[PDB]
Structure 1
């Protein structure tokens, strides 16, 4: 009970979000930041991404999926600026 257009959006989201999340996780870990310290810019960002990823994309409308896709495009851009001072 799904559409190709939405499942295609989900596939792209899954690949993009992985890339963005990994970039932030990698920095937090190679930098020995306390993952339990939300005051740190990078950890706070990591926690926001964790919250964003916990969702079930199969329960979103096409419009919502396109929004999630833009969310990750925006975080892809943002994470690059935050990590690469």
Structure 2
């Protein structure tokens, strides 16, 4: 438990929640079938689900930084795909 790692974990939690919620909201709002991985946005939701399953407390800084940049990437990407009305 270094503050450096604790801090990164705090930031990752907030960002991953933001991204997940944008995807969850859109999937729910557009009434998309959660059990259909063929549907692009659902596939993405399922991918985010796997990502969140990990115990971040078992990661090193380099691994945490890697996870962080994962969520920057999905944040960027999710905004791009969700353009329906």
Tell me if both proteins adopt one fold, taking TM over 0.5 as the criterion: yes
Question: CA shift at 1:51, angstroms?
Answer: 0.2
TM-score when normalising by structure 2: 0.97
Uncovered stretches (5+) of structure 2, i.e. residues with no partner: none
Question: CA shift at 1:58, angstroms?
Answer: 0.1
TM-score when normalising by structure 1: 0.97
CA RMSD of aligned residues (A): 0.7
Uncovered stretches (5+) of structure 1, i.e. residues with no partner: none
Question: CA shift at 1:32, angstroms?
Answer: 0.4
- Partner-residue secondary structure (3-state), 2:38: coil
Question: CA shift at 1:84, angstroms?
Answer: 2.3
State the match for 2:13 in structure 1. Answer: 14
Question: CA shift at 1:47, angstroms?
Answer: 0.0
Question: CA shift at 1:74, angstroms?
Answer: 0.2
State the match for 2:33 in structure 1. Answer: 34
Q: 4+ residue stretches of structure 1 with deviation over 6 A?
A: none
State the match for 1:23 in structure 2. Answer: 22
- Partner-residue secondary structure (3-state), 2:57: helix
